[PDB]
């Protein structure tokens, strides 16, 4: 007698349902990792015995997205190919834990200014049964969490 | 000035300014006389800094409440209360923040309302006054100290001030301004004695042989001037000469501990009276007393000799007392006593 409207309030959310809004378009991905919030630590000790522990400045997140290779055009390729020595169309990423149908966002992770730093092609092997999966890494500046 | 145009203005009016450098363990109540003519008819009023005080009193007066507050705010000083003498027992019970009762030239009405809030248990410390006339020296010192209480929550501080504008500062305010500078830099467990209060001089000169008659018993606590540490208060004893509650440091130390523990344990009231709550109470006290011990306030070079906290189901309270809603802790902790006498013994032998 849990009456599943109470499951939507009280039970934890699984990981296998997520949408990725990449800039102004939604792109289907398989994995999404590295959306951390990390700080440095500043310490100070004197001779009397006082230890002072402080949070430092937060460093940049390194975000890994991976999807499969499809017969159309490679949208992750034309965004990493258009680099001119420091110039890149920086995009904002949203990764939202989603309802089963896709009509509710439960908890989402916002990424402010992401740009690609790597794009690894799949390893071709004649004795394998796998999908060609590209794996892109992104450099950002902050990760925030909105909960609704 | 009246601001009309967006430029830069120039004025040469007589202004004054003092910066707040307050301490949290010194929030005083300045009592004034009911038979006063130049106060606002509000019985209780709140002054956060020197700027708010000169709005309600825009001209320099000479009365005892003005010279107490002007000497308060020029040594840092935070928020403070002007309460008339017929309402100081109510203001302590209502405003929850008061640590000092400063009798600013007031007697025999503050005294009977001091002993009211002490018997009710409001964790305050009183700062009384000596006589405004000169004590002769053939004075019979038990006859001088007969108007004062015998409670361990007060001290007297005899010699009146003669502030540089000519006016007379009550000597409670001289003691209250050395408490502010002591609690900020050295802490509440250090004596307010050798702190130099500025801008005020004692009206009289006191020798060592005069203070030696009054240092026992009910403890006048002289205000003396020295070449070097200029015009400090000299003496740190209370009105009770016992082995426990002598020494104004070790009384104000426990009042700071008793208030800060009950500020932390008010967030654990109306919790279920059970053994997980008793563990969460006695670890909220051990965390407070450990940080207090490691900053030099407690006397012992181990946590076992510095404090103990204990609570149990047949240690401090019984099952008949659990059912009444009572949670009985008992806490013991040791304080540091100051060095009051330095004896030099010279000789011509090596």
């Amino acid at each position: 007698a849990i009456t599943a409207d109470d499951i939507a309030v009280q039970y934890p959310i699984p990981t296998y349902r997520f949408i990725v809004t990449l800039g102004d378009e939604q792109v289907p991905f398989t994995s999404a990792s590295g959306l951390d919030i990390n700080f440095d630590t500043i310490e100070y000790r004197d001779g009397t015995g006082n230890w002072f522990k402080m949070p430092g400045q937060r460093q940049a997140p390194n975000i890994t997205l991976s999807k499969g290779v499809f017969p159309g055009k490679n949208a992750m390729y034309e965004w990493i190919n258009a680099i001119q020595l420091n110039q890149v169309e920086k995009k904002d990423i949203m990764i939202s834990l989603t309802n089963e149908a896709g009509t509710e966002v439960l908890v989402s992770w916002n990424v402010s200014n992401a740009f690609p730093t790597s794009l690894t092609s799949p390893s071709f092997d004649a004795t394998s049964n796998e999908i060609a999966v590209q794996q892109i890494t992104l450099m950002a500046d902050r990760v925030t969490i909105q909960t609704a | 000035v009246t601001t009309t145009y967006p430029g830069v203005y120039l004025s040469e009016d007589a202004v004054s300014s003092f910066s707040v450098n307050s301490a949290a363990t010194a929030v005083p109540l300045f009592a004034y006389d009911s038979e006063n003519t130049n106060t606002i008819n509000k019985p209780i009023q709140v002054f956060r800094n020197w700027a708010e005080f000169t709005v309600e009193y825009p001209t320099p007066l000479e009365d005892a409440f003005y010279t107490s507050l002007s000497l308060w705010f020029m040594h840092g000083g935070g928020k403070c209360y002007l309460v008339n003498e017929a309402n100081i027992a109510d203001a302590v019970a209502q405003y929850d923040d008061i640590t000092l009762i400063v009798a600013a030239g007031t007697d025999t009405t503050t005294y009977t309302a001091f002993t009211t809030v002490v018997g009710q248990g409001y964790r305050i410390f009183g700062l009384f006054d000596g006589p405004k006339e000169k004590i002769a020296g053939t004075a019979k010192p038990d006859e001088v100290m007969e108007e004062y209480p015998t409670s361990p929550f007060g001290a007297v501080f005899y010699p009146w001030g003669t502030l540089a504008s000519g006016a007379a500062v009550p000597p409670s305010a001289i003691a209250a301004a050395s408490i502010t500078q002591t609690d900020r830099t050295r802490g509440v467990w250090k004596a307010p004695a050798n702190q130099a209060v500025n801008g005020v001089t004692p009206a009289f000169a006191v020798s060592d042989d005069f203070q030696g008659k009054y240092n026992q018993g009910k403890a006048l606590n002289m205000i003396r001037t020295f070449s070097g540490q200029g015009t400090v208060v000299w003496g740190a004893r209370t009105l009770e000469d016992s082995d426990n509650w002598r020494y104004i440091p070790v009384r104000r130390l426990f009042n700071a501990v008793e208030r800060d523990i009950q500020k932390s344990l008010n967030k654990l009231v109306f919790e279920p009276n059970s053994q997980p709550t008793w563990q969460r109470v006695k670890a909220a006290v051990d965390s407070y007393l450990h940080s207090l011990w490691q900053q030099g306030a407690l006397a012992g070079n181990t946590p076992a000799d510095a404090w103990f906290v204990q609570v149990g189901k047949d240690l401090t309270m019984t099952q008949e007392e659990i059912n009444q809603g009572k949670m009985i802790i008992k806490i013991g902790l040791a304080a540091v006593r100051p060095a009051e006498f330095i004896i030099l013994q010279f000789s011509q032998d090596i």
Partner: protein, 358 residues
């Protein structure tokens, strides 16, 4: 007036207000609410959020030395923990027509738990508290939040266990409000975060700045051995509700969280057994009813509501034919169930007992 499919801009909006969800604190504010459309003048309407209040009721109502305070009291309700918030607009006090029809309209709506009439007039509340006093001892699970005037119970509800009085009027930037609209908010905040078995008596009141009377300890010492439940001011915290007693001086029903635990458990067992009405009155049905209560009381014990250590010390459910009934009682079509529970009481006194001997 939106016709162009672009994006529109307005510049003098008011900030919106959030609402929470709760099932154990649903109040019925009886105050001087002024409707916009006059069909909801003598009935009870559901106000799911503050946005629903601004559409159905007039939320500005400009003053004339009298000041409208019914719309201000609901904003302090949703700031302190909202709810479905039923309202009954009752304009003047002495109309004994709509006050006589009030307890019959409360029973038609299923889900009122708290009453808490938020009105600054003194004789207005006495007419409301007297009209609702007969419905509190009828086992319906209501709970009145009365307000003291000068430090005593309002005497329409003297010593019933369904009443919690709250003394100091609370001032808003300064109009003085009775605190029942705010305390009805902090019940929904406490029950959502801690449960109904937790005493609602350390919540800092959002919104408001200061009470009208700063209450000392010595006058609370003559008030707390009654159910007066003073709103106190602490300098580090603000305005804290301070006291969790009811009007009943019995050892059983002394505290608010013990009383509202039993009112909430009886309400949820009643909602669970109504599918088992008009079943065949046989021994197979009596075991289906016993298990439905035993499953409910087990999941109260394992979330900390009941004071037990074994789950046979927390509760019991008993039903049978030799036990709790006679054969003449089955034949007239009823089943009789004996349910017992054991609640835990809060710690309201902490004695410190310092020393310096070791």
């Amino acid at each position: 007036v939106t016709s162009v499919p672009g994006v529109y801009i307005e510049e003098d909006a008011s900030p919106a207000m959030s609402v929470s969800a709760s099932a154990t604190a649903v109040p019925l504010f009886v105050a001087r609410f002024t409707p916009l459309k006059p069909e909801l003048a003598g009935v009870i309407t559901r106000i799911g959020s503050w946005l629903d209040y601004t559409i159905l009721f007039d939320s500005n109502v400009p003053s004339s030395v009298v000041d409208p305070t019914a719309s201000v009291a609901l904003r302090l309700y949703f700031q302190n923990g909202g709810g479905p918030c039923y309202l009954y607009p009752l304009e003047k006090a002495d109309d004994n027509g709509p006050l006589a029809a009030l307890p019959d309209l409360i029973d038609e709506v299923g889900e009122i738990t708290l009453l808490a009439s938020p009105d600054p007039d003194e004789t207005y509340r006495t007419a409301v508290y007297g009209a609702l006093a007969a419905s509190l001892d009828q086992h319906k699970g209501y709970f009145l939040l009365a307000d003291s005037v000068n430090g005593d119970a309002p005497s329409a509800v003297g010593g019933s266990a369904q009443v919690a009085v709250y003394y100091p009027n609370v001032e808003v930037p300064p109009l003085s409000l009775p605190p029942s609209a705010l305390i009805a908010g902090v019940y929904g905040k406490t029950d959502g975060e801690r449960g109904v078995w937790k005493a609602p008596a350390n919540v800092v009141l959002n919104g408001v700045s200061d009470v009208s009377v700063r209450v000392t300890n010595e006058q609370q010492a003559e008030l707390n051995p009654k159910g007066i439940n003073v709103i106190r001011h602490f300098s580090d915290r603000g305005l804290v509700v301070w006291g969790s007693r009811t009007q009943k001086d019995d050892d059983d029903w002394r505290y608010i969280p013990v009383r509202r635990l039993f009112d909430a458990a009886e309400r949820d067992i009643k909602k669970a057994l109504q599918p088992m009405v008009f079943e065949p009155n046989s021994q197979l049905t009596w075991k289906r009813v016993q298990t439905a209560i035993d499953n409910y009381l087990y999941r109260l014990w394992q979330q900390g509501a009941l004071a037990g250590n074994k789950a046979e010390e927390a509760y019991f459910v008993r039903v049978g034919k030799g036990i709790t009934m006679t054969q003449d009682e089955i034949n007239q079509g009823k089943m009789i169930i004996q349910v017992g529970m054991a609640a835990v009481r809060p710690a309201e006194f902490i004695i410190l007992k310092f020393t310096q001997d070791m």
